[PDB]
Structure formats: structure tokens, C-alpha cells
Design a protein around this ligand. Structure first.
Ligand SMILES: *[C@@H]1O[C@H](CO)[C@@H](O)[C@H](O)[C@H]1NC(C)=O
Ligand SMILES: *[C@@H]1O[C@H](CO)[C@@H](O)[C@H](O)[C@H]1NC(C)=O
Ligand SMILES: *[C@@H]1O[C@H](CO)[C@@H](O)[C@H](O)[C@H]1NC(C)=O
Ligand SMILES: [Cl-]
Ligand SMILES: [Cl-]
Ligand SMILES: [Cl-]
Ligand SMILES: [Cl-]
Ligand SMILES: [Cl-]
Ligand SMILES: [Cl-]
Ligand SMILES: [Cl-]
Ligand SMILES: [Cl-]
Ligand SMILES: [Cl-]
Lengths: 404, 382
């Protein structure tokens, strides 16, 4: 028989489409166990923020008889698809998209019936709150502003705000509207000179929960309007930002900058990635020079998600346990759930693999626990100008490593 | 067999089901009658909501009236946008917690088919005036485990402009666990300091959650006579208000939504059954008025002879065209206006029902009405 899996990607789906097919391709060439096993898939592309379209495509995928659904979307569609896959007992590996570059907050999912929760989030829980807490405490900040953009979901700040309150910190949450030019013009039109000069001092300590580009514009507008100063310390907080983007921030900043972002283990599974004195062809083992750099974090987790499924298919068949999929169209009210779903889900949860993001596994709460961040601080030399330097790392196992 | 509308209600759907049928019934007393199909779905089940909505659309409907939480509202908004089915959405009270407007998806320009029957949440405006009038500089805002703090955005921004220091603290569902956790993690001095910060607080809680919260605070000696707590929620009953003041040690304020009071005509709106309106929740009122709004829209549509028959719409095909009569029907509803249980209902260009009114109650020395706030004239009284 055949292993058939469904995939749903929001526009722009080009990188996901490519990476997912690379993953499946890598398996059929190298997987010595799924050797002689066929692997097929159907990829659906949907508009962003279109949960109904997501339901249409997922339901079409259910008629094709799929063993699992891999998705990469925003939260609006994730919520709908989680609800759908719960009802149909279809294992659902959900790779949360970067929301327009903004800092990520975990999606608000629906309650599941006991022992029938089929959505597995591939990306780890957002642990930026923990790193921000350590950082403001080490810096001995008592008062500070947290700027967040028009897409950031501040519910993600819950644990930070509760802990900040217990510590007696005074935190000011300020939304930055999409038009940065109007944001700052508004300051000068609504505030007297003294109020404005006071406001400038309050801005000496800030956290930027912004996208890389939004942060760049925000910094430039602050400097141009003379609301920035050398006597400031701004902390950019986002799982995702590139090195060129970091340079744009420090090149624009007058004062000190700190950056918190996710990093990944160096994948040199030597010997693991070697066969007969020959290196294995695969994105994980032999990557093209500069390619993984062009990928977004969610692409990495998409690749590893496919590895996770393959691992489950290994274990499912070695035990000689197998359930064939049935043809079900779910919009139709009379549709029955997949009887083999519970077993397939369980097999996936007990899985463990090492991929582009490092170790992937699922705890009892259905979370992929490991995450690691680096903490960068600004530096300067007449020769090279403004550059960032690594000061420390933070991971979900051992916590902080290094000083601040 | 010409006017057909679809309805979807989350469990518990009993009062909505009941009130929806009363609205249609009251109308039928005053040729072409309104017919309907009601679907009941599980709470927090957007997929089920889509299934029932799609089934209703194959039967052909002129409009969809729903009363659900935000998860299902989001899915149904996306559906009705695609099919061009007018969608009157009555947001449910989230377990009694203070309401935050649902986060809806972007719609194509001029093709946004969801109309929220309940007005925008204006509690932020009232809270702003109140803390400024009370000359509060530092205070805590307690919110429960169901409250969506994205709803506080405009309050937080304005508070920052005014230089207020606001502490946001989540109160989990297990009230017994809340305070016990404090006594185990804080030194005597730290806890005594915490106690002082609690002299000024806003309660974004359910009526019952607030009652339990106040009692737990008093029992653990974190409450005091020299405190002032403000309960903020569109919905709380008179008996529930009394439970708060009976439990409170210090001063209490309550902010809540209020509504105008309406041969006598037989109908829920004019001749109310004794004790009947007392059992209704606010969303039930807006659900009733929503049906009035639709009937008024169907009236104007037919007199102008610009009628469009209902179509059979299939959600599976993708090749299915949206309802040709959808845009004109939507436009007709938006230009509509009626007076119902909630007072005037209408829709601006931003598709919002703008009017809302609150009363402010304070603190013998028992609770009494101090002032009102409305979205047209603002504060009245002091
Ligand atoms: C913001 O406003 C300015 C001035 O009105 C305009 O030039 C600009 O296009 C607007 N949008 C953005 C994204 O800056
Ligand atoms: C901590 O960081 C150092 C680099 O300074 C590294 O060599 C070491 O392996 C790390 N160990 C732990 C336990 O974090
Ligand atoms: C609430 O907290 C108490 C604290 O011990 C615990 O015993 C109880 O089980 C909790 N209730 C629920 C419903 O979890
Ligand atoms: Cl600002
Ligand atoms: Cl922005
Ligand atoms: Cl400061
Ligand atoms: Cl990357
Ligand atoms: Cl830790
Ligand atoms: Cl449910
Ligand atoms: Cl949602
Ligand atoms: Cl707001
Ligand atoms: Cl608390």
C-alpha cells in the first residue's frame, strides 16, 4: 500500500512547498526503512486569514485518505483546522507561521475532548517571556516601556506581566501603529515641550516587540525626531531576525541595543549523515551552501515535522501494526472519524528525531519543549563601525549561560 | 416559503432558541411569513459551525443569524464572506467574563458580510474617565482566566499618555489557589507591600468570580477598609451587585450596561411576561433585535421590488458562485434602523452598532446610582 499525507500552506507558500517536497524526496532516496514503501502527498495552497478555505481544502484531503495533515498557517486557520482534525481523528502537525515578521504568540486553540486532541504544535512554546524577565532583572530596570506592533498578540505577555507585577516593576505597554510617521507626528502634536522632554527620558529603557523592519523604521523615526539618545538601551525581542537585519538596527541606533533571537544546534551528525564512506544527499546532511540561511524558522520545523512522521511510519510498520485510511468528506454531516487516528497519533507523540532544529519530541502536554536563544549586545570600532556581539545563551533545559 | 433565514446557536442554546422564535412570532402578528432553520452546535467548535452553516446554505437562506463565541464567529465570518450571505453575529458572554470584541479576518473591499449586533466595547472609555476623576495614579487591574486583554489596548495607550502606572494581574479560575500562592512565595514585607498596592484596583472579572475574589481577599486579610475596587463588566444583575457590596470591606464601584424601558401589543418588546426579561442575558436582547433588523430589511427590499430569491449554495465545489442577492441585501440591512429591547439599533459604514450606555454605581452607605455614560454625550453626573 501507500503512505499518503496532506499538506496545507498559506500564501506565500513557495518556500514551504519547496521544503516539504525536499523532505519527502530526501526520505524516499535515503530512508532505508521506508525503502520499498511508497510515499505520496497532496499540497493545498490557501489564502492567508481564510479559515473557510482551509476547511474546504482539508476536507478535500480527507477524501484522499491521509494518515496525517501537516500545516503551516496563521492562527485563524490553525484554530479551524484544529477543530476539524479533532473531529476526524486526523493527526495534525501544525507549524505556526511568522506573523508578518512580528514576534510570535502561540495560537489560541479550542478545547479538545479528553484523549482526542489531535493537534501537535511543532514549534516550541514561546519562551521569550523567560528571557525578557532575566534580562530586565539583571539590568536592574524598575521602569520601562514595551513597544509592540499592530500584529503582536499581547496575550503572549501574560506570564511576563504577572511576574513583573510580583517584582513590583512598572511596565508601560504601548502599541506602535503601522504608520510610524504618524505615530511620532502625533507625539509632537499632542504633547507640550515639557511633557515631550519627559517622555524622551522614559524611552531610555524599552523593549521592542516588533518585526525587524518595523524596528528599523521605529529607530530611524526616533533618531530623526530627536527622541532617541545615546543614553538609551533598547532590547529587540523576536525569535526571528537575520544578521543583515540586525546590522540595520545597530547602524541606526544611537544608544545601546540588545537582541534576543532563536538559534539552532550545528547539525554535524557525522557518520549519521555518512553511508559507505559517502555523505548522504539530503537537506539535513548535505545542505547547499547558503540555502538554510534563506529559509525562515517555520521552514526548518516543517522539514523536521516530516521526519517526525516518517519515524512514526517506521515504528508503526515494524510493530506490524497498521490501519488503512478510509475515504471521508467531512463537510458532510454524516462523516465518521478515522478509526486508525488515535493509534497513529499516539505513535507520532512517542517519536523522537534529530533534525534541522535539533531534537524534536512531544511531551504529555503535546508540546515540543526545546528552544534556545542567543543574547547579543552592541559593540563599536572605528574600523568596522557598529557591530553586535554574543553575550549569552538561554535554553529551556539549563536556562542562562553567560553574563549580562 | 420565500423568506427563509438560518440560525446557529452554541450550547447552551435554550434561551437563544426560545427568544429567536419569539421574535419571529411577535412579527407574524403584524402575507409572506419568515421561516427558519435553527442549528445547535457545541461551544468552541468552529468546524461544526461550518458544517451546519453549509447545510443551511444548501437549503438556501437570505441571511445567517448566529450567537457564538469568537472561534466559531471567525470561521463563520470567513464562510459568509465567501458566499455573500449577510451575517448578523451576536457575541456570547464568555462565561460571564468581561467582553472583548472578536478578532475577525480581513474582508475584500466592500464585501464584509458580518454585522456585529452588540456595540463595540466602550468600557475602556468609562474606565479612563473614572480613574482620572478618582485621581488614581497607581492601580491594579485584575482580569480572569477567560478575559482577552487585547481588549484593553486603547485603555493602556491612553493610560501611558497620562503617566498612570497600571499593573495587569491574571486571576486564574481556581480562586483558592490564587492567594495561597502569594503567601508561600513572598516575605512578610513583600506581602505587606502587595497589600498596599491593592487599595486601588479594577476588577475585570465575572460577577461570581468577583464575589469569590473579594471573599478570598477579606479572609486572607489582603482587603482593607481603606480600599476602593471598581467592578467592570457590561453584564451583572442587581442581586449580583448586592453580593459584591455585602462582601466588600472597602468602597465599591460598579460599571455596567443599561437599556431603555419600552390596546397594548402582544410581544416580548411591548407586553413583557412578568419575570421573563429578568431571565434573559444581554445577548438574548440583541438576538431579538437582530431579527427585528432583518424583518425591517426584508420589508424595504420587497417594497422597492429589488428582491433576489435565495440560492442553493454548495461549500464543497469551489466552483460555486456566491449569492447574487447578497450584496444588495447586506446594503439594505446596513441602511436599516429599528427600536427594540436594547433601544435603537443601526449600522454605521464601519458596520458597527454604535450606541451603548452604562451606569456607574458607588459604595447605610449602600450602593446607589452616581452617573451614566453613553457613546453620544459621554459622562453625565459625577
Ligand atoms: C504613512 O503616512 C505618510 C504621510 O501621510 C505616507 O507618506 C506613507 O505612505 C504612509 N504609509 C506608510 C507605511 O508610511
Ligand atoms: C555554556 O557556554 C559556554 C561558552 O561560554 C560553552 O562552552 C558551554 O558548553 C556552555 N555550557 C552550558 C552548560 O551551558
Ligand atoms: C484548586 O486548587 C486546590 C488547591 O490544592 C486543588 O486541591 C483543587 O484540586 C483545585 N481544583 C481544580 C478543579 O483543579
Ligand atoms: Cl508611541
Ligand atoms: Cl509597525
Ligand atoms: Cl527609564
Ligand atoms: Cl534559519
Ligand atoms: Cl529554565
Ligand atoms: Cl468542543
Ligand atoms: Cl480565532
Ligand atoms: Cl481597544
Ligand atoms: Cl494575584
Amino acid at each position: 500500500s501507500i503512505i499518503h499525507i496532506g499538506a496545507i500552506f498559506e500564501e506565500n507558500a513557495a518556500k514551504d512547498d519547496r521544503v516539504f517536497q525536499l523532505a519527502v524526496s530526501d526520505l524516499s532516496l535515503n530512508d532505508d526503512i521506508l525503502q520499498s514503501e511508497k510515499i505520496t502527498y497532496s499540497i493545498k495552497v490557501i489564502e492567508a486569514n481564510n479559515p473557510f478555505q482551509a476547511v474546504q481544502e482539508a476536507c478535500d484531503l480527507m477524501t484522499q485518505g491521509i494518515l496525517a495533515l501537516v500545516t503551516s498557517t496563521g492562527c485563524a486557520s490553525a484554530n479551524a483546522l484544529q477543530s476539524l482534525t479533532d473531529a476526524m481523528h486526523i493527526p495534525h502537525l501544525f507549524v505556526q507561521r511568522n506573523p508578518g515578521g512580528s514576534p510570535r504568540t502561540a495560537c489560541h486553540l479550542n478545547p479538545s475532548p479528553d484523549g482526542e486532541a489531535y493537534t501537535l504544535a511543532s514549534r516550541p512554546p514561546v519562551r521569550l517571556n523567560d528571557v525578557m524577565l532575566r534580562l530586565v532583572t539583571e539590568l536592574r530596570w524598575q521602569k520601562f516601556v514595551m513597544f509592540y506592533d499592530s500584529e503582536y498578540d499581547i496575550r503572549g505577555l501574560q506570564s511576563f506581566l504577572d511576574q513583573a507585577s510580583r517584582l513590583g516593576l512598572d511596565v508601560s505597554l504601548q502599541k506602535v501603529d503601522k504608520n510610524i510617521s504618524h505615530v511620532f507626528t502625533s507625539l509632537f502634536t499632542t504633547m507640550k515641550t515639557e511633557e515631550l522632554n519627559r517622555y524622551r527620558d522614559t524611552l531610555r529603557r524599552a523593549i521592542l516587540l516588533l518585526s525587524p523592519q518595523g524596528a528599523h523604521s521605529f529607530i530611524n523615526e526616533a533618531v530623526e525626531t530627536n527622541l532617541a539618545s545615546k543614553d538609551s538601551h533598547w532590547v529587540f525581542v523576536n525569535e526571528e531576525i537575520s544578521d543583515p537585519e540586525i546590522l540595520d538596527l545597530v547602524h541606526s541606533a544611537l544608544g545601546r541595543m540588545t537582541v534576543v533571537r532563536q538559534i539552532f544546534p550545528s547539525a554535524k551528525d557525522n557518520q549519521k549523515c555518512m553511508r559507505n564512506n559517502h555523505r548522504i544527499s539530503s537537506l539535513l546532511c548535505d545542505p547547499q551552501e547558503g540555502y538554510l540561511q534563506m529559509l525562515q524558522i517555520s521552514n526548518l520545523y516543517l522539514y523536521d515535522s516530516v521526519l517526525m512522521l516518517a519515524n512514526a511510519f517506521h515504528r508503526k510498520l515494524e510493530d506490524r501494526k497498521w490501519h488503512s485510511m478510509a475515504s471521508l468528506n467531512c463537510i458532510r454531516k454524516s462523516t465518521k472519524p478515522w478509526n486508525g487516528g488515535r493509534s497513529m497519533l499516539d505513535t507520532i507523540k512517542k517519536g523522537h528525531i534529530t533534525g534541522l532544529t535539533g531534537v524534536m519530541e512531544f511531551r504529555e502536554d503535546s508540546s515540543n519543549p526545546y528552544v534556545q536563544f542567543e543574547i547579543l549586545g552592541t559593540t563599536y570600532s572605528e574600523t568596522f563601525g557598529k557591530d553586535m556581539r554574543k553575550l549569552a545563551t538561554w535554553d529551556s533545559e539549563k536556562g542562562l549561560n553567560g553574563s549580562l
